[PDB]
Each structure stands twice: as C-alpha cells, then as structure tokens.
Ligand binder design. Structure first.
Ligand SMILES: Cc1cc2c(cc1C)N(C[C@H](O)[C@H](O)[C@H](O)COP(=O)(O)OP(=O)(O)OC[C@H]1O[C@@H](n3cnc4c(N)ncnc43)[C@H](O)[C@@H]1O)c1[nH]c(=O)[nH]c(=O)c1N2
Ligand SMILES: Cc1cc2c(cc1C)N(C[C@H](O)[C@H](O)[C@H](O)COP(=O)(O)OP(=O)(O)OC[C@H]1O[C@@H](n3cnc4c(N)ncnc43)[C@H](O)[C@@H]1O)c1[nH]c(=O)[nH]c(=O)c1N2
Ligand SMILES: Cc1cc2c(cc1C)N(C[C@H](O)[C@H](O)[C@H](O)COP(=O)(O)OP(=O)(O)OC[C@H]1O[C@@H](n3cnc4c(N)ncnc43)[C@H](O)[C@@H]1O)c1[nH]c(=O)[nH]c(=O)c1N2
Ligand SMILES: O=c1ccn([C@@H]2O[C@H](COP(=O)(O)OP(=O)(O)O)[C@@H](O)[C@H]2O)c(=O)[nH]1
Ligand SMILES: O=c1ccn([C@@H]2O[C@H](COP(=O)(O)OP(=O)(O)O)[C@@H](O)[C@H]2O)c(=O)[nH]1
Ligand SMILES: O=c1ccn([C@@H]2O[C@H](COP(=O)(O)OP(=O)(O)O)[C@@H](O)[C@H]2O)c(=O)[nH]1
Ligand SMILES: O=c1ccn([C@@H]2O[C@H](COP(=O)(O)OP(=O)(O)O)[C@@H](O)[C@H]2O)c(=O)[nH]1
Lengths: 505, 505, 505
C-alpha cells in the first residue's frame, strides 16, 4: 500500500493541471492532490525576471478567453480592477520597410503598387478557384493559397509560418485552423486598395487584459493560491519520475509513492510514455513533432519611441531577423520593467559597441520580448542567437544603432509548440485511447498536443473538462471538438454551479 | 409558504420528464419531485389496449438510441433477455402496386423503367446544379428538388410529406433532416438501377429492439418504477393547472401548491404559456405549428399472410388510402395481441360487411397499426376515419375483402408532431430564452418543439441534460445541436458516473 | 414593254447602292442602272453646309474599313495624299465633370474613388458568376450585367444606351455588339485602377482618315463620279414611287417605267414594302424598330480653346445635356468650316443672350456637331432641341457662356439607327426571304436593318456582295455573318480581279 492515496491525481500545475484542480476543489467530492516539479506553478505560462528587473513571459502571451469558467477563476484570483491593465489588440506585420496592420491582406495599400497588382491578381485567381472548389484543402499550404492567393501567400503567411513552426507549410495539416472555408474576401481587400486605406482589426471591443504585476505568471500563482495548500506538492518533492499504469501508482523523485484511481497527466505525453516505461507508447509519441522556443528579452533605456508607440505584438516574415514575433512587453504593464528612478548601467549599444560610460543612469525603460523557433529542420546557434536578435532589431528599425541596452535575457524551452503535422492525428488517435484504457487522462498543450486548443484558456478547460468527465460524465468538448468550443458561447459551466448553491442550503 | 417545496420540480412523466427524474435520482443532491396528470407515465410513448386484447402504441415507435445513458436506464428498467425482441428493419414504400425498399430515393431500381427515367433525369439535373451551387436551400421543398430532383419530388417526396406533416413541403425549413431524409447519390442510385439491386440499409434504425410486453409503454412504466414513489405524483392529483413564474409556484388540480427553485417543464410549451397566464408567451407559442395524429388499430384473424411476412413498417405516399404509415405491430411482439387459443367473434369483414354469425372463433391473430395526420391545412373526418382506413387497407392489398376483423381502435392525439416550419426557430428563440430567464427549462417533443431531437432517446436526454445544466453546468447539447449529438456516439454520461463510485468509498 | 430594261436595277445611291453599282461596273457583264431621289449621292453618308459655310455630316462619321475592296474604291475616287487627313482617335466620356477615356468600362481608373469601388465590386460579382455560367445572355441588359456588373451598368451602360438607342437595354438583343461594346477584363481594369493608368486603345477606329474637302459626303460624290453617267439617274427624275414585284417593274415619279431581271433595293425596307403595295410586307416591316437622329451643328468664333484640343468625339451619359455625342468636327479638316479671314456676325452668345455688336468680324472658327436620339419611347421637342443643345454645351463646359455662335444647324433624319430589338431577327427572317423569292435583294443600313454591319464600309460591301451573289453565286457574308467579316481582314475581293486582268489580253 502506497505512501499517499487519492481518487484523482493531477500531475503538473501549469494552466491545465490548475484547471483540473480548481474543478476538483469546487466539486469537493473525490479526494485529490496536485504535484509539480517546479516550486512555482504556471508552466509555460510562467514569468521570468532578469537581475536588472525586466520581466519576460515565455514569449508573447495574450489572453483571449472562450469560457465563463476561466473568467470566473481569473476574476476570483485577481479581483481588484487594478490587478489588470486593458489594451487594444494592436499588431502589425513587418514588410519591406513598412509596419503593415494586421491582418496583412487588408492593408497591402502600404506596399508598392507593383506588388499590390501581384497580390490582387493572385487573390482574384483564388476567388475564381474558390467559386468552383468542391474539395477541402489537404495541407496548410493549400489552405493558405486558396484563402490568400499566390502573391499574398509569398509575402507573409508562407515565409512567416516556416519561421514560427520551423517546418514547411506543405508538411502541416489545416483542419486546426477550423471549419471556415479557405476563400478570399476579394471585395474587402480590393476596396481598401482602391481607397488607399489601412485598417487593423482592433478597437474598443477587441481588447485583452494583462496582469498588473508578475506578468502572466502572476495569474497562475494567484489561482494556485486559492487551492487548499496541503493538497499541493510543488518542487523537487513533487517531481514525478515513474508512472506504473498497471498498478496505478506514481513515484516522486524523493521516493514518495502515490496511489490513484484516475490520473490527469499534464506533462508532455512523450515524457509520460518514458515515465511509464511503455516501449509501445514511447515509439508512438516519438512519431509526434514539436518545435523548441527561444525567448530573447532586451531592456532598453529611454521613454518609449514614437516609432514604437502603442504596438503590442509584431510579425516578421522576412529573413533580416531570426525572430518570428516581437512583443513590446513594456506596453503590457508598467511593472514589467523597472521604474524610471532605478539606475542601471548600459551593457551595450544596439549595434554592439561599448557605452561611452560605465556609470549607472536612470530610466525610464522599455522592453522587447522576442521569439525564435528551433527544430531539426531549422537549427539555432544558441551561442550567437542573442546577438543575432539584437542585430535583427536594428535591421527591422525597432532599435536605432545608438539605442542603449540595459538588460538581456535568453532561455530555451525545449517543448514550445506542438506541431500540427499531417501525421499528428493519425498518431494521437492511437496514443490517447491506449492511455484512456488505463484510466489516464493525458491533457494539455503537450498532454494532448493540439495547438488549436493550446492557449491558456483551452488548457485550463482541458483540465476542467477532464475532471468533469471523470466525475460527472461530461463530454470533453475542448479536447475533441476545437471548432465547436472556439466558435460558441461557453457560458453554462461556472465556478459556482447549481450543485454548490443547493448544497449550501 | 406553499404546501410543498423542492429545488427542482419536473412537470410531466413522459420520456423527457422521466429523464430529468432519473438524473435527479442518480445525482441525489437537490430535492425534487415529478408530477403528471396521468396515473400511467409514458406520454406519447404509452400503449393502449382494446377490450379484445390488441395493444397499440401511439403510432409506430421504433427505438434507435444515440446515447449510452438511455441504454443504461432501459437496461436497468428491463434487465432480462426475454424482456426484449430484436428485429431487422423491413420497410417499404407502396408505389403503383409495388413495394419499394426504404428509402424510396435510394431504390429507384425497383420502379418501372419509365418512372426510373423521370427520377434519374431529375437527379442528373440536381447533380449538375449542385456542382455549382453556393447557397444553401431555404425550404424543405427546395432541399428536396436540389438533392433529388423534380422526378422524385413529384413521385414521392411532395405527396408523402404533405400526407405525414399535414403541411406542404414549401412551408417547412430543411435543417432538421440530416438523419431523417436520405440524400441520394447519383452514381450509387444509377448503378443499382443498371444492376437491378436494392439499397435498404440507410439510417439509424436498420435494427431495433422492442419490449416483449406492454408495448413501448412497458418501458416507461418500468423506468418510472425505479424512482422513489414518494417523489412522484401521478394522476388527477398531479395535474398542473397554474404556473406562477414570478413566485416560482405551481398549483395542481386539487389545490396543492409546489414551490420550486428551478422548473423543468415537459408539457407542450403552448399549454405552459396558458398555465402561466402570460399573454405575450401565449401569443408567441401560437406562432408555432403542430399536426395531430389519429392512430387506427385493426386486429385480424388468421396466421400471418405471406404477402405481409416480416414487414415492419410501410409508407403510403398515394391518395388511395388516408394513412401515411402502417406498422405490422404483431411482428414486434407475440404479446401485442391475443394467443391463438383466444376466442373472438368477427366484428366485420375488411370489405365492410357484417359477418355471417356472432360465433367466437379462435386465432391466431395479427395486427395493423395505422397513422393519419391532421392539421388546419388537412382536415380529417373523425366519424369515418376508421372505415376509410380499412378500405385503404383493401385498396393497398394489405387486407383481402374477406379478411376477418376482430378488433378496432381509434384515438386522436392533438399534439402529434411538432412541425419544423420556416418560422419555428425565429419563434423559439423568442420563447425558450424568456422562459430560461425565469428559471424555467421547457424541454421535450412539445416542451422545446424540435422534431430532429424528438424521439424517445432524444426526449429522455433533454430531461437528463436539463438537470445536468441546472446542477453541474453541463451544455445542453441535444437541445441546441441536433446534428452534433445525432452524429456521434454519446458514451460519456452513464447511469453510474465517477461521482457515485467515489461517494461509495 | 417598259421605257427602260436592265438586267440589274439598283435603287438608292448611298454607299450600299454605289457598292452595287461599282461591282456591276467592274464586272461589266449584265446591263445595269442606278437611281436615287436625291441629285447628290451619299444618303446618310452625305454632308450639309450652313449658309455661313460650316459643313456637317449626318452626325459623327468615322471610317473603319474591314475590306480591301472598299479601300480600293476610296483610293480610286480620292487618289491624292492631300485628299485626306489622318487622325489619332481622341475620345472621352463625360463623367462627374471630368473626362474619362473611351471606352468607359476599361478606364474605371479615371473615376472618383467611390465609383471605382462600385465598379470593381460589380465586376467581381460578374466574374464570379461568369465562372459557373452555362447559359448565354439573351438581352443587351443581361449581357451588360454579366460582362461588366451592376456598377458599370448603372453608372454608364444603362443610361448612356437609352440615350443613343432611344430604347432601354432590356428591349435589345446582344448578338450585335462584338466590335461595338468592349468587354472589360477584371484583372486589367483592376490593375489600371491600382496603377492609375489609362487604356484608350480598344476598337477598330483608334486611327482614322477623313476627307479633306466636302465632308464624308465628298467620298460618295467622288465614288459616284467614276460611274458611267448614262447609267445613273439622280434627282426627282430618279425617285421610285411604285414597285411591281410581280411584273418586275419599277415606276419613277415622272411616270418612267423600268423593267428588271434582278432588283437591289437599298431604300428603307419599310418604304420598299409601301412602294410594293404589299400589305403583308408592310405588317412585317412595322414589327421592326428604328430611332430618329437629330443633328445639331454649332459654329463658334475663336481659335480652338485649350479645353477642347485634339478631342475627336465625346460621349455624354449624364442628364445636363440632351445629346449623347459631340464631335469636334473642325478637327477633322480645316475645310469643314470657314477660313479665319471670313467675316461673320455673331448670331448669339452661348448663354442665349444677344451679341454686343451685330457687325461681321473675323475668325478663326471651330465647330461642334451634336447628336440627339428620338423614338416613340423617347420623344423630342423639335422646336426647342437646338436651344436645349446649346444650353447643354454650357452645362458641360464645352462652351463658355460668352462664346460667340456664328452659325447653327438642325436637321432631323427620320431613319437614323436600325434598332437591334429582341424581335429583329424573327422579323427579318420572314421579310428578307419573302423578298428574295421575288428576286429582290434588299440591302443596307435600312435595306437589311442590321446595325452590326451598318457602317459605310459594311453598307458598301452589302451592295457589292449582293451583286456578286446575283452574278457569281458568292456568299453574302456581310449580310448573314457579321462577326465573320468583322473579325477578319477581307482582302480577297479587289477593284481589279483576275477576271479583268485575264480579259485585258
Ligand atoms: C512561445 C509561446 C507563446 C504562447 C503560449 C506558449 C508558448 C510556448 N501560450 C500557451 C500557454 O503557455 C499554454 O496554453 C499553457 O502553458 C499550457 O499549459 P499546460 O498546463 O498544458 O502545460 P505546461 O507546459 O504549461 O505546464 C505543465 C506543467 O507540468 C509540469 N511538469 C512537467 N513534467 C513534470 C514531472 N515529471 N513531474 C511533475 N511536474 C511536471 C511542469 O513543471 C509544468 O508546470 C499562449 N496562451 C495564451 O492564452 N495566449 C498566448 O498569446 C499564448 N502564446
Ligand atoms: C406518431 C408518432 C410516432 C413516433 C413518436 C411519436 C408519435 C406521436 N415518437 C416520439 C416519442 O413519442 C416522443 O419522443 C416522446 O413521447 C416525447 O416525450 P415527452 O416527455 O417530451 O412528451 P410527451 O407528450 O411524451 O409526454 C408529456 C407528458 O407530460 C404530461 N403532461 C401534460 N400536461 C400536463 C399537466 N398540465 N400536468 C401534469 N402533467 C402534464 C403528459 O401527461 C405526458 O405524460 C417516437 N420515438 C422513438 O424513439 N421512435 C419512434 O419511431 C417514434 N415515432
Ligand atoms: C448618326 C449616324 C452616325 C454614323 C452613321 C449613320 C448615322 C445616322 N454611319 C452609317 C452610314 O451613314 C451608313 O452606313 C450608310 O449611310 C448607309 O448606306 P445605305 O446606302 O444602306 O443607305 P443610305 O440611307 O446612306 O442611302 C439610302 C439611299 O436611298 C435613296 N432612296 C431612298 N428612298 C428612295 C426612293 N423612293 N427612290 C429612289 N431612291 C431612294 C436615298 O436618297 C439614299 O440616298 C457611320 N458609318 C461609318 O463608316 N462610320 C461611322 O462612324 C458612322 N456613324
Ligand atoms: O422512403 C422514405 C420514407 C420517409 N422519408 C422521410 O423520412 C422522414 C421521417 O419519417 P420516419 O418515418 O423515419 O419518422 P417518423 O415520421 O415516424 O417520425 C419523413 O418525413 C420523410 O420525409 C424519406 O426521405 N424516404
Ligand atoms: O392544425 C393546427 C391547428 C392550430 N395550430 C395552432 O393553434 C393556434 C391557434 O390557437 P387558437 O387557441 O386561436 O385555437 P384555434 O385557432 O386552433 O381554434 C395557431 O396559431 C397554431 O399555432 C396548429 O399548430 N396546428
Ligand atoms: O465608352 C463607351 C462608349 C460607347 N459604348 C458602346 O458602344 C456602342 C457603339 O457606339 P459608337 O459611338 O461606337 O458607334 P455609333 O453609335 O456611332 O454607331 C454604344 O451603343 C455603346 O453602348 C461603350 O461600351 N463604352
Ligand atoms: O420611334 C419609332 C416610331 C415608330 N416606328 C415604327 O413605325 C411603326 C408604327 O407605325 P406608325 O407610326 O404608322 O403607326 P401605326 O402604323 O401603328 O398606325 C412601328 O411598328 C415601328 O416599327 C419605329 O421604328 N420607331
């Protein structure tokens, strides 16, 4: 008989595991506990800080919630109005010296006329083709072409998506983009060209909120703190090293064993297979594909430059920079970087030269967070990637050669994106049911490996729904039907349901 | 304070209400009770018996379950093997003296050559227009013409559907029919014409099980029996006369008042509106449409005729008989009619004449169940409908003129089919949300008025899911997404969920 | 025995009759003769002159030859290089107070931005519908909507075409327009909108030559002069009043009778029917439709204004003027108006007011020629149309209010355009064969009533080909296959054929 026994064991306290935990805690029926190898909950939704005081999420993290239940927990965790800042969803695409508003096609009036011709001609071809299309596109690349046409494809989505996914667009499926037909809005695009008009898809309605303190990682610390502490086990004392599926026991690094009746695993499914010592599942999970993420942070002296302004995130299809995305992280919260009165020396200038002085000087400061993808089809030289990113910032005119850099940050996250390869579903529909047969709910960004339901809210709800399936027999909608949950009003499930209202009488 | 107070009150003990009751009973949290004006539960899924011992369902009732939860409750209620009979579906459409395998549109091969031409020609035209169509059909009639062509429309779909729906095809929408109306495939249908092959396998009820005793009504009597008796109130004592939505109070016929927190109402929603004395709702519910159903039963002396054989239910598009469907109800169970030793006099011959004597002779007996529709667009002579049905049986060669009729049955059910009119959804989205904001869950065949989820399993699950939404914040999937629940295997929710398993440990 | 007998009689000495005459004269086999009621040959290709010395054609006459035979005869008649002036076509459409290069539909790029959107949107709809179309358009309006879209239809094609044809586009067929109405290309037109480029080169009259003296009418005077005088009878002495098709006898106004073996009649076919006293033919001809043309000429004092420049003819779709077209007739030849030293009093100022002086003053002079259509569907006030035209010139800024008018011209031509009505062909295939049976070749603009082969070269060749059929069994290609002769270079028939070469030895 094991050291600890519980009805439901949750491995991992990133968003998915915390969702499972929040729902278990709310139901307050079956016994449970949650473990994690990190002392700080949050997983890939955590936040780091540099010795100079610049915070960085694991790349650009922007919340777009599809669920009331997620809103209920975030509101419970950070309830005061100044626990959050609200921003319009402002983004641009860097293209031929221009910051083109997102989405790219509605803004090609900024491009040279010769290119507008090429773009509109291709989109005309695509519209005429879409009018008689009776088949669905099979690859990401076929979907891009059919929706954008050849010309607009080549400028943005094709070279951009290679830089994100670190695999070619011809190697990915396209079901993950949803059930909407790959077709051009030719009239809308052509109208903006005729009118010489730009127009981004943001505004008063198209907002996001960002935590005032602690970056994105602050949310999940705050949510985890609503859990009964004695049911949590975070740190080296919570690292799972062995899973015995046939015996329903888990072993921690410090030798502690935990018995379960149902297991919600939120670790990477390939790590799970290894921890189970199941050669068959190991072989199957190795057939999946993922890219690694390098996050580069650069802290800059100065008030925010006019050329930067209220930009939030930025896309980089071109090859004059290694990053696919930049975030003006200082625009998300004033507490993402030191106050103006904090004194820091200049480490270097953006062109790489030494500062004129070594003295500490005051701010204010602003901050850029960059993402570089890595895979076997796209290597990354870890020794030079920081300097390459900074050169990238000059090339894209985000930084002047003279701009003063006061903080740098680089970290590699091995499992960054679960790739929607052509083979992904063929592999997962083998892996997930074999685990399901052993009472293991493998869920999450890498627990279930589905990017289209791979955001914080999706993840959290994957945990919530898993628990609901285990206890109340609910359908796991987010797991199995991404287009469905992403397209509907998910308002039925709440942090206080009927069951708790009736029980309290 | 009212006489009785429950958290959830369930009005009606047909399948929908019994569903709510079963789930409320399983969950065993909030207090509840269920009321019906009938002493015998079952609603339109009940069974009558004639004084001569012939049972008749409310028209042809064949179970095709889309849900494990529904299976669990039927199996609990009738757990023995000899509680059920299994049957292969044998279904035909009567057309020009011939029997055409169901579905008609997939069996053009059995028609005379000249009618095959008209049908295939129409289907070729439809196929070619459909290759370039980029707008969905609006009405049932447009859908028919666009999916099958004019030949099949005129020969079968238009007269048949007026004859069952009691409105023309032009008056109905076409989003309800995914699992009711087969779309013919040009190549497949033409291939079977050339090869002279049938294709009678389409649809969810190609196999079915029928209760050995009590008809369909036996199921719901048995299901109801599994509930705690003290939480039920069936009979005159349970007839709801007033619903006061603002006070959350219901008044029964005997003056008993029941206070509730949440109301699941499964009575026809137009009745509910009247009971609420809500003139705005009465006005809205009157924009809905329904047809009435006459059920005619005919008991016949003799061993089962060869021309009848293993036939299950039969469709009649033609105007030489008033009924749209006949069921060989004696094929569903030996106990739907008397044993062969039972002595019964002949009441009349099928040709309408008196028999020679009043002598009670033995059997065996077989039995036909007929349905005639009625509406404000399709009047029915109540006084002659029985004799008209019997003559229809002679015209269609179901009965020989000399056949000996030993029992007759006729009953009119005012609310038979909830009609999928063009206006339905526009009216329902004014009605159901209004009731919802008063904490009223109106659900079921006439409770929420949606035929595409209007079968026994559907109904049962509307009640189940309503409770699950009330207690556990579940999505009401069957109510809002018929194609979704009709096209998947719904296996997640069970009579015993983890909740009950864990609570017993 | 009649007064005169010839093998072939030609009625009319417009271009069609002269064509018949020239071919008969070249062949020099059958005896022949040509009559006209007018002392001066030319018909609708004649030229009038005002007492002040301003010449006016019957509206805008620009030669675009499809035939080497036609060129041969023009070169014979006017052999000197200084008999002709060559011009580049400068043609615009008046829209929203600006000039848009002809053709409108290829020059969307010169419209105001909001109309560019309207136009391109319509063309996009048309392109998408044309992608799946399997039916040919039946009316002119349907053709416009299908080839150009609603934007161009409403802004230009519908109002402009009513303004010329004097019937709505819905009343006309669309088989006539191959070389009359440019079909815009979506990609090309959109490209030129993006690039702000013009495309003014469409169609056969992008370059033209105009006779140096006598206007267009001078060509036909000179061509007629090459005919042997004794075989011509022009004037009151050559007016046909009765045609006796059965006795093959024509009666002239002075009572002179002419016997023929074959008749080539170039007069309006309705007039021919009347001259034949053939009530069945009259009824048939009355099913045809034509519009009348008002020609208004305005002579203006002054050197050619900068705003006019090298403009040739100009289209006016809008309602601030009654004419559909203006020609800068003084640009076609310096001899279309008086020399600069000619003294002429001012008749009026363009704004209607009397001149400051009544004295004769010098030039130079320029000259405007206007056209206004009339029909039973578009009445015209004969008494005010001159003044209305002049005011229209002020409205469109063709004339300053202070411009001095020294000459005015107004003439109504009752048969101006043979309308391509829906009924035209149905009617003509009754008429022309019934005349063919009587050995009458009815040919020409109103002789055979087909606008698509209704220009001077077409007409001329209808006469030539008529004769060639009578004598040599040639196919009448221009008559029966307009798209055939308009789409090729017709080089085979020359003013000197092998026949004449071989015979001269
Ligand atoms: C570059 C980039 C950019 C974005 C995003 C991610 C990345 C990488 N996201 C996605 C977001 O980060 C993601 O949805 C969640 O972090 C997924 O959480 P999971 O809990 O499934 O696992 P995740 O990897 O977060 O957490 C898993 C947890 O399991 C633990 N674990 C692993 N092995 C263990 C073991 N053996 N024993 C014990 N514990 C173990 C880990 O410590 C970790 O805490 C996002 N989201 C969004 O809402 N908006 C956005 O804009 C973005 N953008
Ligand atoms: C002709 C025909 C044919 C078929 C079918 C129906 C009909 C009419 N059905 C559908 C099936 O009958 C249906 O799904 C259920 O009976 C509907 O369940 P409810 O609980 O919604 O309504 P239903 O009408 O069954 O039950 C409502 C109940 O509420 C009660 N009630 C009404 N007013 C009240 C009041 N004032 N107070 C208290 N109680 C009140 C009534 O007494 C009744 O018992 C079927 N299904 C299938 O699975 N296979 C099939 O082939 C068919 N075919
Ligand atoms: C407003 C407008 C604009 C244009 C044009 C016309 C008009 C009205 N044309 C067309 C051109 O004018 C036309 O092609 C010829 O004039 C037609 O020659 P027909 O000989 O068939 O008849 P046409 O009518 O020219 O000649 C008929 C002859 O028959 C004679 N006649 C009638 N009744 C008679 C009787 N009872 N007895 C004896 N003789 C009789 C008449 O006197 C007349 O001479 C043109 N062409 C072109 O090449 N380029 C252009 O841009 C244009 N544009
Ligand atoms: O051969 C057939 C018989 C029926 N139907 C259609 O199927 C529908 C459902 O009838 P069914 O008898 O399966 O169900 P019920 O009327 O008993 O609810 C009808 O409305 C018909 O339009 C069909 O398309 N082909
Ligand atoms: O065959 C029918 C006859 C009537 N109704 C409904 O009944 C309403 C009329 O209600 P009223 O109480 O005025 O009763 P009725 O007019 O039928 O006598 C109509 O609006 C319809 O919605 C129906 O659905 N089917
Ligand atoms: O910009 C323009 C001007 C004219 N037309 C069409 O061209 C036809 C022929 O007109 P045009 O001035 O060539 O010849 P005409 O009327 O003098 O015979 C007209 O009926 C118009 O419908 C056109 O499509 N675009
Ligand atoms: O603008 C017009 C007016 C009349 N017509 C023709 O002239 C005939 C009418 O004849 P008319 O003016 O003699 O009157 P009606 O013969 O009917 O009395 C019509 O059938 C038309 O063919 C025409 O082509 N254009």
């Amino acid at each position: 008989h094991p050291d600890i026994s519980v009805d439901v064991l949750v491995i991992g306290a990133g968003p998915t595991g915390l969702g499972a935990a929040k729902r278990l805690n709310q139901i307050d029926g079956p016994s449970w506990m949650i473990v994690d190898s990190n002392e700080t909950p949050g997983g890939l939704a955590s936040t780091d800080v540099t010795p100079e005081g610049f915070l960085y999420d694991v790349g650009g993290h922007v919340i777009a919630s599809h669920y009331k239940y997620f809103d209920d927990c975030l509101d419970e965790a950070l309830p005061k109005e100044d626990d959050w800042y609200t921003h319009q969803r402002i983004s641009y695409v860097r293209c031929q010296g221009q910051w083109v508003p997102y989405p790219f096609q509605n803004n090609i009036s900024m491009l040279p006329k010769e290119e507008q011709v090429k773009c509109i001609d291709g989109m005309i071809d695509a519209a005429l083709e879409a009018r008689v299309a009776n088949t669905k596109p099979k690859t990401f690349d076929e979907w891009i072409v059919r929706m954008m046409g050849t010309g607009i494809a080549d400028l943005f989505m094709r070279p951009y998506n290679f830089k994100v996914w670190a695999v070619p667009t011809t190697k990915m499926q396209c079901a993950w983009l949803g059930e909407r037909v790959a077709a051009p809005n030719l009239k809308a695009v052509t109208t903006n060209v005729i009118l010489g008009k730009t127009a981004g898809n943001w505004g008063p309605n198209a907002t996001f909120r960002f935590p005032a303190r602690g970056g994105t990682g602050g949310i999940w610390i705050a949510v985890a703190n609503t859990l009964p502490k004695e049911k949590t086990r975070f740190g080296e004392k919570g690292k799972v090293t062995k899973v015995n599926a046939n015996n329903k026991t888990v072993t921690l690094q410090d030798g502690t064993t935990i018995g379960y009746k149902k297991l919600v695993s939120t670790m990477a499914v390939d790590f799970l297979a290894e921890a189970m010592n199941d050669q068959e599942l190991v072989g199957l999970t190795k057939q999946l594909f993922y890219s690694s993420t390098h996050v580069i942070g650069v802290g800059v002296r100065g008030s925010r430059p006019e050329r930067i302004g209220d930009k939030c995130w930025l896309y980089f299809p071109e090859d004059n920079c290694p990053f696919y995305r930049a975030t003006i992280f200082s625009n998300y919260s004033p507490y993402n970087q030191p106050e103006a009165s904090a004194a820091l020396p200049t480490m270097q200038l953006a062109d790489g030269s030494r500062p004129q002085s070594t003295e500490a000087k005051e701010g204010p400061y602003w901050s850029i967070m960059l993402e570089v993808s890595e895979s076997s089809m796209k290597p990354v030289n870890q020794e030079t990637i920081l300097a390459d990113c900074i050169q990238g910032l000059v090339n894209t005119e985000m930084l002047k050669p003279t701009d003063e850099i006061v903080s740098t940050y680089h970290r590699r996250f091995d499992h960054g994106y679960p790739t929607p390869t052509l083979e992904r579903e063929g592999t997962l529909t083998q892996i997930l049911p074999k685990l399901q047969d052993k009472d293991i709910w493998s869920r999450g960004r890498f627990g279930s490996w589905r990017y289209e339901v791979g955001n914080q809210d999706h993840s959290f709800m994957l945990g919530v729904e898993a628990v609901d399936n285990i206890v109340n027999g609910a359908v796991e909608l987010t797991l199995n039907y991404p287009d469905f949950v992403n397209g509907r009003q998910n308002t039925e499930r709440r942090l206080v349901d009927g069951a708790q209202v009736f029980a309290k009488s």
